[PDB]
Scaffold this motif. Structure first.
Motif, short mmCIF file in Angstrom:
data_model
loop_
_atom_site.label_atom_id
_atom_site.label_comp_id
_atom_site.label_asym_id
_atom_site.label_seq_id
_atom_site.Cartn_x
_atom_site.Cartn_y
_atom_site.Cartn_z
N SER A 58 12.38 -61.44 -25.32
CA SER A 58 12.56 -61.17 -24.68
C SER A 58 11.40 -60.36 -23.19
N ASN A 59 10.24 -61.56 -22.21
CA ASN A 59 10.18 -60.39 -21.79
C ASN A 59 11.30 -59.57 -21.10
N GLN A 60 10.64 -57.96 -19.71
CA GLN A 60 10.89 -57.29 -19.30
C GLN A 60 11.87 -58.23 -18.28
N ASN A 61 11.28 -58.51 -17.25
CA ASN A 61 12.61 -59.57 -15.73
C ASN A 61 13.43 -60.34 -17.20
N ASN A 62 12.75 -60.87 -17.85
CA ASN A 62 14.00 -62.49 -18.54
C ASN A 62 14.95 -61.67 -18.42
N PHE A 63 15.51 -61.20 -19.60
CA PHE A 63 16.76 -60.22 -20.19
C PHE A 63 17.46 -59.18 -19.24
N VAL A 64 16.61 -59.66 -17.65
CA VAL A 64 17.38 -58.67 -17.00
C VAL A 64 18.06 -59.96 -16.18
N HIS A 65 17.01 -60.81 -15.96
CA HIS A 65 17.71 -62.37 -15.45
C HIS A 65 19.18 -62.27 -15.85
N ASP A 66 20.00 -63.07 -16.83
CA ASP A 66 20.16 -62.73 -17.88
C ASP A 66 21.29 -62.16 -18.03
N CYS A 67 20.93 -60.49 -17.34
CA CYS A 67 21.53 -59.00 -17.50
C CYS A 67 22.41 -59.31 -15.69
N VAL A 68 22.10 -59.35 -14.34
CA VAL A 68 22.61 -59.24 -13.64
C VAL A 68 23.87 -60.00 -13.94
N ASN A 69 24.07 -60.62 -14.09
CA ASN A 69 24.96 -62.33 -14.20
C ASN A 69 26.04 -62.02 -15.01
N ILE A 70 25.95 -61.33 -16.05
CA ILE A 70 26.91 -60.08 -16.62
C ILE A 70 28.21 -59.13 -16.64
N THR A 71 26.89 -58.46 -15.37
CA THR A 71 27.26 -57.19 -15.74
C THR A 71 28.12 -57.38 -14.01
#
Length: 147
Positions: A86-99
């Protein structure tokens, strides 16, 4: 043209920056404390932080009530610290939804609720909160290891 000698001298310039402040009265108001509790995630790991989200909207709703919930919003997120490309912004993209999903459903379950306003105001919190977890973890890592 031709050239001839001359005499003269001196140099000066104006200064126009006045300021005239005045004093004002002071006031103080109360505030309350609140928080949230997670039910479960089923596949994501929780990171380390202290609650400190800082967002500015320049809108009506930020003053109307968001300022109270600003203190209740956490900074820690649930993410994939496992071996995933994952790139720094890529895991963030996934993270916003679940959080945001775990936060909105748990308030509803707790006898609180969330509306379109809550989604919109919390989305901006969560966007930076996910990258904030990585940037603080990586800073700790390069200093003394992750914690």
């Amino acid at each position: 043209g031709a050239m001839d000698p001359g005499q003269g001298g001196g140099t000066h310039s104006q200064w126009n920056k006045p300021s005239k402040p005045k004093t004002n009265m002071k006031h103080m108001a109360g505030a309350a404390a609140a928080g949230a509790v997670v039910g479960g995630l089923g596949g994501y790991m929780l990171g380390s932080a202290m609650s400190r989200p800082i967002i500015h909207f320049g809108s009506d709703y930020e003053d109307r009530y968001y300022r109270e919930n600003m203190h209740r919003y956490p900074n820690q997120v649930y993410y994939r610290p496992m071996d995933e490309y994952s790139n720094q912004n890529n895991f963030v993209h996934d993270c916003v939804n679940i959080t945001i999903k775990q936060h909105t459903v748990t308030t509803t379950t707790k006898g609180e609720n969330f509306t379109e306003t809550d989604v919109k105001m919390m989305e901006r919190v969560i966007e930076q909160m996910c990258i904030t977890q990585y940037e603080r973890e990586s800073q700790a890592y390069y200093q003394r290891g992750s914690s």
